[PDB]
Design a protein around this ligand. Structure first.
Ligand SMILES: O=C(O)c1cccc(O)c1O
Ligand SMILES: O=C(O)c1cccc(O)c1O
Ligand SMILES: O=C(O)c1cccc(O)c1O
Ligand SMILES: [Cl-]
Ligand SMILES: [Cl-]
Ligand SMILES: [Cl-]
Lengths: 217, 220
């Protein structure tokens, strides 16, 4: 099974959706979970955090890293979706899309990489999107932000490979597709797999969970 | 050969590097070229220059609206603006992160916002965007640069899809940053590939990205 007993697990975007399902799944698997979100009863510890807010990420992460022994798993599951034709998208939606969808994980990585290096090992799973894999009308900015996020996460994975850290992604969707859209609980199970000891030879990979809509791209 | 006589061509990043070499190559091929850049500190520009920050949406809107009032057709847009700021991910400064994305993705975004209506109205034309092989494979020291170039590529491909019904071709070149094969590619050599993709000889090529780095990505 998927067992994370005793492990310290951080999940961003934990107030709803994929991040919430993932946090709950880690709690069920025996982990000590902290969930982070803009705002929020929860069966895990909660921290308010705007992942785009670099000063808040620094303050919150520094405080928490003082009291833990290892950060066993980091899940980046924060994100926002702002759709529109490329030439109709507002300036605010462009800036916010990148600040959250790329800057968020950037800020987390800036504050956690030294911990991964000093402890050795651990796993990072980042939630991208199948829009990072194929052009999607109406999602040029969203897709582009998720493509940046994927690229960033893979280079961070290369930077941390010498420390033994495994770094992977899941790309949810937004007779093909096959079956109903994949729900947060299904995404959460894939995240736990990639975070687990059963995936110890898997790094720099990205599993698309969208019923095949990208035709393998 | 590559003939652009009578065509109106816009090139960003035209003050130096690849954008300059591309603007010069289009001038030599007969085009009427306008170059855009933050600075034109070189000693020679045989094309019209517009000095502005392509990352600034308001400046791009004002300049491009004015220029589009005076031209009948925008035959080619080349997005060649870009800055390279290197560092370990957890050492990169906030300024370097912000400016990397503002220039390397925001610049092309602003140009697309101001030119897509023109491309639709005229029913054709070509766009070429300069990405990087760092968008294709992770490169230590280049996490932000590569990520910005991956966003740029994604954006350009979706714009290409949005404009495909108007007959617009939209492609990319990804320069570098017994493999690699040959010496480092000079700006003039990258410019040649851009001219090819902008040309009628590429009329059925769209949504493609030619990596020009001596094979360093091994086909990725
Ligand atoms: O329980 C699981 O879901 C599971 C998934 C992947 C691999 C495993 O070993 C598992 O137990
Ligand atoms: O002259 C060229 O560079 C050229 C390049 C691509 C295709 C052509 O036909 C050319 O003439
Ligand atoms: O562009 C490059 O970086 C490059 C490097 C080595 C060999 C090449 O041909 C190149 O184009
Ligand atoms: Cl979600
Ligand atoms: Cl606006
Ligand atoms: Cl001059």
């Amino acid at each position: 099974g998927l067992d994370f007993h005793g492990q310290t697990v951080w999940v961003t975007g934990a107030g709803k959706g994929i991040g919430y399902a993932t946090a709950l799944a880690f709690v069920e698997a025996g982990a000590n979970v902290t969930g982070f979100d803009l705002a929020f009863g929860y069966p895990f510890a909660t921290e308010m955090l705007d992942v785009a807010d670099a000063d808040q990420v620094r303050d919150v992460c520094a405080r928490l890293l003082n009291d833990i022994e290892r950060l066993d798993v980091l899940v980046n599951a924060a994100g926002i979706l702002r759709m529109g034709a490329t030439d109709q998208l507002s300036a605010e939606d462009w800036q916010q899309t990148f600040a959250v969808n790329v800057g968020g994980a950037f800020n987390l990585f800036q504050q956690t990489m030294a911990q991964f290096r000093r402890q050795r090992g651990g796993a990072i799973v980042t939630v991208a999107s199948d829009a990072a894999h194929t052009p999607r009308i109406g999602m040029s900015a969203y897709g582009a932000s998720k493509a940046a996020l994927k690229s960033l996460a893979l280079t961070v994975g290369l930077e941390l490979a010498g420390s033994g850290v495994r770094c992977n992604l899941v790309s949810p969707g937004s007779g093909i597709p096959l079956g109903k859209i994949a729900r947060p609980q299904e995404i959460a199970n894939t995240i736990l797999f990639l975070a687990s000891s059963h995936a110890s030879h898997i790094t720099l990979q990205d599993i698309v969970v969208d019923g095949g809509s990208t035709l393998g791209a």
